[PDB]
Structure formats: structure tokens, C-alpha cells
Design an enzyme around this catalytic site. Structure first.
Site: not given
Ligand code: CO
Ligand code: CO
Lengths: 355, 354
Positions: B9, B25, B31, B99-100, B198, B274, B277, B281
Site C-alpha cells: 500500500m 486509500l 480495499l 498503491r496509495y 491487519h 515498520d 502501525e 498503533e
Molecule cells: Co491499514
């Protein structure tokens, strides 16, 4: 003094009449079902008679009765004969089956065991994939029966809570799958999609952190490695019922979806080890039976009496015995994540020698 | 003349490539299926709405995503190997197609044509296949091949999954083992190993997506290598909106267990480096905001791990050394995926066609 090898699993009505009691047992478990308490020996039956008709008809439709017990006592008996030449220091190994809802329930078997003078017992759960809702309920029950029919415990229990990648299991599934693939055209044999179909779980059980979903998945990937990923495959779920959300990718739903664009589909009883309502009725009469694609849909034979599979179990029980572990490294975690009204507080109190 | 295009991504390189990223996104129906008919429209609405918080997160971790760097580093490094390992395919130029995120498939396909690439491999940096990811990624490459290369110059082939690559497994293993060394010996075998991946919208799960089960394969393999020494569990992080998502949320499992455990480890089981997330997160949210910051630790991300990189290089070798411009599973993946602009023929997308 005989060592008890007790095969466990939710169970199924031996013969049609057994439905009522089977459904009653089911509908009287808070491990999941009500709240209540004695305003619910009542409410329980108000549900059992209701449901009895439907179920009796389903069993009537599959020869009348669940083959589970027949097959279980059989597997249990073969695994014990082998265990006799295999594990002599646990000399006599006697076949016992203890179903959670069908007959013999845990208490019935426990009674028979003691009156057979059993010293050591192995709670061999027939679900290779541990789910607090399956292999878990048997344990929480075993606990109660221990406390009820054997306080000051004359029996020392150990348990085999899971065996997702036991060699016999994996080999047995392969072979059965190739064996079944062979009875497909050929110019299309490698394009038949293998649908491993396990009993689904309610989302509010999956989200609980249950170990079931991922274990089933490990078995699936293992079998595919064995078959050198020759065919396309996918893990789907069946048996979901009710309004609540269930572990997605429903077997029937996906069957009908792919039915047109595919020239071959195979369903595999990945989460259970013998035929029962799920294969004989849900898949054979349902998914396959009533589909206009009946032709390009076949089911991989259930393990049942498969010798390779039996030897796998023997290998298992033997390793379990000689390892001295009373339960897998995962059980304590499961019990801390599981959800029940009358759980097991200390696993180490339930299993082991408490002279 | 041979391109190795790593793909995932991506992430905002600068604190504000954010709104662009978040827009791109959520504008993707592949997605998260939010609105088959008004995704883009609802997208910028969500983008402009979530940009504040997210921008502040990218700043609580250095002001940007390290994804681009780590990706580029791995790309070139894996490529250095292939030169000595697969001389049979001359220079191997490291590419990255997000992707994004910044280097979009567009930007990148251009370069490759300018650099005269004849053959290339779309190397999904997602060991586990999912339509929301690898699929989206591919559905785009198809659009890029159609707009930027109608001549069919480049010959593409894809690595659409690698759940149990040896290097991957071994890396994660070693990385999990050494981290357990930080826990006091008397408790080491007791630390619960939470593999946090994820999550996925249940909408994607019930389509038959291959992802959940593939992550499961990696985790298991990893536990065998570790001889099931500690307790473990596959949990899920990341989700958004009211829509239901998969498994048990990492956050919740963590908060619930804190009181019952001696220790908890979190493993970035689903990614290759890394990023927001792990760095936020988990580190700042789950770990550093729990009154248990102590009995909680995070396994090191693969990033520039040599065991890992060598496995990838070795993976690419196997791939190239064969036919299959894609795996056996892809077609079914495309039969089950859900898109407004799918690939009708994988057979036409990857090949020589000239
Ligand atoms: Co995500
Ligand atoms: Co059921």
C-alpha cells in the site's frame, strides 16, 4: 489397572428417538445457551419438543441416526489395540467414548470407568481443532463429573486438546482427496477447487480470541503442502444458523456462486473425523443434493475407519502419554479467553494425579 | 532490463502526503467496500475528516512513514543478490510501486519503460494474499499496462503470495526468540505471543478471501519452528468505521489479558517493515498507554533483516526459474474478489503478448 482412552466430541443421536434427549442436553447448557436457573429445566424442554420434529426428519433422511457413536467406539477400539503393542507400560487400554450431548454423556461413561477400576485416563478430544465451544465444553463438563462422581479423585486425567497437523491426519486427508479427485474427468482434474468446509463459529465467539479458526487453517495449509498445491483451494464454513453474524465465507453460498464458472468442486470434512449430520445431510443432501451442479460437486470421504488415520491417533496418544504433559501449552490461554457460566478455574486441579 | 517491483500500500513520506494517501486509500472500493456507487465521493469526505488525527500520528513517530525507505532498501538489497544468484537475468533493477502512496504504479511503470525493462516481476510485499491488497495492487497494474504500455513492451509475472517462505519464517522466529530474552527467565516460557495482523472487513472475509487462512499458515509454521514453547494467538488490529471486522481486536485482547499474564509480545506477522502501525498503533497505543507497558514488548519488524532479505531474493529466484507468471490460487482469487474494475483475464495480464 487399565488406562482409559476416552474419545470425546459433541455427539449425535444414535437413532431417531434419541433426538429429544439429545436436543434436551443441548438446550440445557449455559456454556453458551440461557440464564435462568431452574426457571430453566423448565424453558429447556419448552425448546426441545419444539425442535424435535425437524431434527428427527433430518436423521430420518440420512438412514435414521448419526453414525458418530458407531464410528467413535470403533476408532476408540482400534487405537486401543495398537496402544497395547505400542505402549506396554500403560498395558490395558480400554475404549471409551464420552459425548457432550448424545449418549453416553460424560457422567454415564465416568460411572462405567470407575466400575472398571480405571487409574489413568486420557480425555482424547476428537476435534483436532480446539474451540472453547467444542473441546472446551467437554473439559468444563469433565470437571463437573469429576467433582460429582469422584471427589477425592481415584482417576488421574490428562487431555489431548488438539492435533491439527498430526501426520496421520494430514496423510489421511490427502490420499482421500486425491482418491476422490481421480474420479473426475482428467482434462479438468487439476482445476477442481478443493473446498475445505469446517463447522462455522458465531462472530462473538471468534472475536473472543478462540483458537478454532486458525488451527483449522493450519491443517488446510498442511494438506495443500502435501498435495504440492496442485489444485485451487479455500477454507469455507458451514452449519451457521440463526440471525447472529457467523464466520464468513459460507460453504453453500460459495458453492452456488462458483457453481457456474467452475467445472469441478470438492468439499472436505476438514474439522471432523467421521460422517455425521454435517456431511451426510448438510453437504450430501444440501449443497450437493439440491444444486443444479450436482454433477461437478463431490465430497471427499470422511476419515471414518481410515487405517492411516487410526495409526495417526495412536501415534498421538502414545506421544501424549510418554510426554507427561497433562495438556497443551495453549489450554490455559484458551480458558482465560473462553466464555462460560461454570468454567474451570484451575486446569492443574482438573488434570493430574490427586491421589 | 529486468525489473523487480516490490509492492504494498505504501505510506506518506512527509507528514502531508497524508491527505492524498488517505484519499487514494478510501477511494478504493477494492480495499474496503464502502460504497460501490460513491466510493471516491465518500472518500475525500473521509479523507478530509481523518487527516488531522493521522497527520498528528505521523508526527508522533518522526513526521512520516519509513515504508518508502525500508521498501527501497529491501528492493535494491534483494536485487544485489539476484545479480550474483541469477546471472541468467542480467541487471535486476529495484522498483517500488505503492498503491496509495507516493511512487504510484503510474509513476513507476513510466520509469521502467524509460529504463527499457523487457521483463518484470510484480513482487507483492504481502506474504499473504488478499484481494483488498494484492488484488487491488494487480487490478491497478492492469490499468497501467493498458494506458502506459499498449505495445505490451514489458512482460509481467507476479509473486502473489508466500505465507511460508523459509527466510520469512526463520527471521520472525529468531526475532521472536531474542525478544523473549528481554523477559525474566522464570517467565519466558509464559509470555503469550500475540501475532497481530491487519484486520479485514467481514465484507471481504465472507467473499472467500484467502488472507485470514494464509496468515494462519505463517503463524503455525512459526510456532513449529519454536516447538510451541509459549502460548500464542492470532489477533487483528487496524480496523475502521462501524462495519464489522475480523477476529479478536489486538487492542481488546491485549487490554483484557494484561491482568492475567506475566507478559505479552506483539508480532507484526502481516507486514514486512515498520510503519504507522507498529510504531504507533502498537508502540504508542497498545503498549505505551497501557498500565502494563512493562510486561508488554514488540517483536522487531523484519525491515532490513538479512535472513528475511535472503529469503526474498531466494524467493524471486524460484519464481523466475519457472513458468507461472502467477500462482495456482490467483484465478480463484479473482473469481471470489469484488471489484468495479477487475481483471477479466489474468492470462492476458501476465505474459509476453507482443
Ligand atoms: Co491499514
Ligand atoms: Co452446529
Amino acid at each position: 489397572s487399565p488406562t482409559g482412552i476416552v474419545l470425546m466430541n459433541m455427539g449425535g443421536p444414535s437413532k431417531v428417538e434419541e433426538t429429544y434427549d439429545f436436543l434436551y442436553q443441548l438446550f440445557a447448557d449455559n456454556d453458551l445457551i440461557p440464564i435462568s436457573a431452574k426457571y430453566q429445566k423448565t424453558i429447556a424442554k419448552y425448546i426441545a419438543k419444539f425442535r424435535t420434529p425437524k431434527i428427527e426428519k433430518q436423521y430420518r433422511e440420512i438412514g435414521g441416526g448419526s453414525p458418530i457413536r458407531k464410528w467413535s467406539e470403533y476408532q476408540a477400539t482400534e487405537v486401543c489395540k495398537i496402544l497395547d503393542k505400542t505402549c506396554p507400560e500403560t498395558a490395558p487400554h480400554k475404549p471409551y467414548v464420552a459425548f457432550r450431548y448424545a449418549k453416553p454423556l460424560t457422567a454415564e461413561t465416568y460411572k462405567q470407568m470407575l466400575k472398571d477400576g480405571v487409574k489413568k485416563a486420557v480425555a482424547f478430544s476428537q476435534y483436532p481443532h480446539f474451540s472453547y465451544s467444542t473441546t472446551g465444553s467437554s473439559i468444563n463438563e469433565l470437571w463437573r463429573q469429576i467433582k460429582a462422581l469422584d471427589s477425592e479423585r481415584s482417576i488421574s486425567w490428562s487431555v489431548i486438546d488438539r492435533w491439527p497437523t498430526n501426520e496421520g491426519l494430514i496423510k489421511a486427508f490427502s490420499e482421500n482427496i486425491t482418491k476422490k479427485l481421480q474420479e473426475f474427468p482428467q482434462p479438468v482434474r487439476d482445476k477442481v477447487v478443493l473446498l475445505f468446509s469446517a463447522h462455522s463459529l458465531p462472530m462473538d465467539v471468534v472475536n473472543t480470541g478462540d483458537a478454532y479458526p486458525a488451527e483449522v487453517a493450519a491443517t488446510v495449509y498442511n494438506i495443500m503442502q502435501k498435495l504440492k498445491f496442485k489444485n485451487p483451494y479455500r477454507l469455507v464454513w458451514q452449519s451457521q444458523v440463526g440471525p447472529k453474524p457467523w464466520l464468513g465465507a459460507q460453504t453453500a453460498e460459495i458453492a452456488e456462486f462458483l457453481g457456474p464458472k467452475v467445472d469441478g468442486l470438492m468439499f472436505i470434512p476438514i474439522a471432523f473425523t467421521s460422517d455425521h449430520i454435517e456431511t451426510l445431510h448438510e453437504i450430501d443432501l444440501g449443497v450437493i443434493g439440491e444444486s443444479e451442479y450436482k454433477d461437478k460437486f463431490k465430497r471427499c470421504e470422511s476419515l471414518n475407519g481410515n487405517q492411516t488415520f487410526i495409526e495417526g491417533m495412536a501415534d498421538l496418544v502414545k506421544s501424549h502419554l510418554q510426554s507427561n504433559q497433562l495438556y497443551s501449552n495453549q489450554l490455559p490461554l484458551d480458558f482465560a479467553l473462553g466464555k462460560s457460566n461454570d468454567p474451570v478455574k484451575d486446569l492443574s486441579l482438573v488434570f493430574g494425579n490427586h491421589e
